[PDB]
Design a protein around this ligand. Structure first.
Ligand SMILES: NCCCNCCCCCC(=O)NO
Ligand SMILES: NCCCNCCCCCC(=O)NO
Ligand SMILES: [K+]
Ligand SMILES: [K+]
Ligand SMILES: [K+]
Ligand SMILES: [K+]
Ligand SMILES: [Mg+2]
Ligand SMILES: [Mg+2]
Ligand SMILES: [Mg+2]
Ligand SMILES: [Zn+2]
Ligand SMILES: [Zn+2]
Lengths: 345, 345
């Protein structure tokens, strides 16, 4: 083994109490016990050294995200409370079809402008946890750049749904995209980001969509049926310089590893012909057969197989944690990917 | 003078229990007591004959709204319930900036595709109430077309935020736009729609935006500060043939009638030069100094002056009821407009 994990205790600063779901406010799926359970499994399995993140500042964040958005995330909660709202910060209105993509002054307008959904409440400490999660990913990228074959960025909150200036799907900063852009800024000519979380990495796709230096691939449930609904379809192959440098691979309900791994192989062949200098894996274990909000049927053992197949790509590899919501198995599942990468069958 | 009022007892079929507001689910502002209080004031003041709407079917609604959107509103609640959701039907995800305006299959995706906000819950009876409210406006239009100088369509739910295929702002069918298009379909060459509700009539603006046969004017609170946030700015003057046939007049918080009436005069001047054959007034009394969600400062007496000034345009006039959420005064305020129109000071 010996794969290092980066973990920040500041993730628990994000501990919201409400999530809009089926017309009700429920206890959030993206809860701090997710990160604590994975961390406990990392320790129990003696995967490798565990370290806290270094502070990289907002520079590397703003290589991917707009300055207006970064500013909004820092002040959103304070403005929400100042305006007198009594719940957590949830968007109520947005730029509907036929409306202008124009940034307004009021906090409700800004919330809607910068969001793609209302299940991602903001409260005190969300900014701090998001900042820490991006630094977790950047610390993992640094470890790999300086000689580690791979590293595990135990990110929370997750990142892959966040656009340059849009938050949602429990994500604020796109940790995987930030790590990929760090590779590029450090002179890695080509980077691939492979998204194995159950949901489409729409944020990552959007950020590099017109670019051929960063190849983006996502396997995910059919957006006709599940979040994010309005991106992730297989006809989205990129634009401009980036045409043919994005690949979406879609699956229907009940898809098992025997079928999902065929898409994995197609994604692997695409990476191989792209021949990147570094690989970022946006790893969600919500592909699990017990995941409460997803519809694939991977077993815990399949994650060993996934990790083994990823190692065979022979690339410097940064894993960023995304989704996965069966907390009983989340640690067994996530660490299985790392152990399969390191040689366990 | 006397004015007839069209009222549907079917408005009570819309009776939702939740509204997303400031991160909480609260009792809805747009409540049945609004319509019942106005009707009781219409009776107590003996304004004129009260009658129920005629059923015109969806034909006239579909002159304004798309077939797909009208189908969605009919089935939305049933699909939501069949999908297992336990609350009222509230959008959770939508077409964020950078995503595709593409209709998906899942009801959550459809809900988001067809909405601009999350404060407008759908439940059993919403479809029937929306239909009845459109018929209320169409009956008033018929009364005027057949000889009445003016008629009061006591619509609930309101309409002016609804686009051809977007609902929100408590609106589903754009009653004012449906009445305007009915005038046009019956051979009235030119129609003006004047929106004195506190909020921008973005739906009416969008529906006629590229047309010169239907002049749309709205006075409203600055959308930089209040809903609908992403339309309503004074630089939106129309497009194509519709250029110069849309007019937005914006005011900041605390604006009193002494200032607001100056914008009203500007709108009346624009109407006079347009010289329409019929007038539809989308009437909200949320401009009232005690409205709980708005920031203008009209008094109850100012509505008599409003009614009088609108009569002086000398046009066949349909009033469609929009917003206004201080139930204590909503009856006095709205009927004051009708009474001022009939010569009461
Ligand atoms: N209360 C809304 C229902 C659940 N939310 C939808 C998907 C959010 C994204 C989660 C994820 O794991 N993305 O990778
Ligand atoms: N819970 C949302 C806060 C208050 N609602 C927003 C404005 C809806 C438009 C109402 C209206 O009267 N438009 O004319
Ligand atoms: K994915
Ligand atoms: K790309
Ligand atoms: K208005
Ligand atoms: K127009
Ligand atoms: Mg506001
Ligand atoms: Mg759904
Ligand atoms: Mg009062
Ligand atoms: Zn996921
Ligand atoms: Zn209003």
């Amino acid at each position: 083994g010996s794969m290092k994990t980066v973990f920040s205790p500041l993730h628990s600063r994000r501990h919201v109490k409400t999530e809009l779901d089926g017309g009700l406010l429920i206890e959030p799926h993206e809860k701090p016990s997710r990160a604590e359970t994975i961390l406990a499994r990392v320790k129990d399995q003696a995967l490798g050294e565990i370290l806290e993140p270094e502070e990289f500042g907002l520079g590397p964040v703003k290589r991917v995200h707009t300055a207006d958005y970064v500013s909004f995330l820092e002040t959103c909660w304070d403005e929400w409370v100042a305006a007198g709202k009594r719940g957590e910060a949830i968007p109520t209105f947005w730029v509907g079809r036929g409306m202008r993509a124009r940034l307004p002054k009021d906090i409700d307008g800004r919330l809607g402008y910068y969001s793609l959904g209302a299940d991602t409440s903001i409260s005190d400490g969300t900014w701090e946890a998001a900042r820490a999660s991006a630094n977790v990913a950047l610390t993992a990228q640094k470890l790999v750049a300086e000689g580690e074959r791979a590293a595990f960025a135990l990110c929370r909150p997750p990142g892959h749904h966040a656009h340059a200036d849009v938050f949602g799907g429990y994500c604020f900063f796109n940790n995987a995209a930030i790590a990929a852009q760090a590779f590029r800024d450090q002179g890695y000519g080509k980077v691939a980001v492979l998204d194995v979380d159950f949901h489409h990495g729409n944020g990552t796709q959007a950020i590099f969509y017109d670019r051929s230096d960063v190849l983006t691939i996502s396997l995910h449930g059919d957006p006709d049926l599940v979040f994010p609904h309005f991106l992730g379809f297989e006809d989205e192959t990129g634009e401009g310089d980036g045409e043919a440098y994005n690949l979406n691979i879609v699956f229907p309900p009940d898809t098992p590893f025997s079928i999902w791994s065929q898409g994995l192989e197609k994604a692997c062949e695409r990476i191989r012909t792209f021949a990147p200098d570094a690989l970022v894996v946006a790893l969600g274990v919500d592909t699990f057969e017990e995941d409460p909000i997803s519809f694939f049927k991977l077993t815990s053992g399949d994650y060993l197989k996934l990790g083994k197949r990823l190692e065979q790509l022979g690339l410097p590899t940064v894993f960023t944690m995304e989704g996965g919501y069966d907390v009983d198995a989340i640690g067994v599942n996530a660490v299985n990917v790392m152990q399969g990468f390191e040689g366990k069958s």
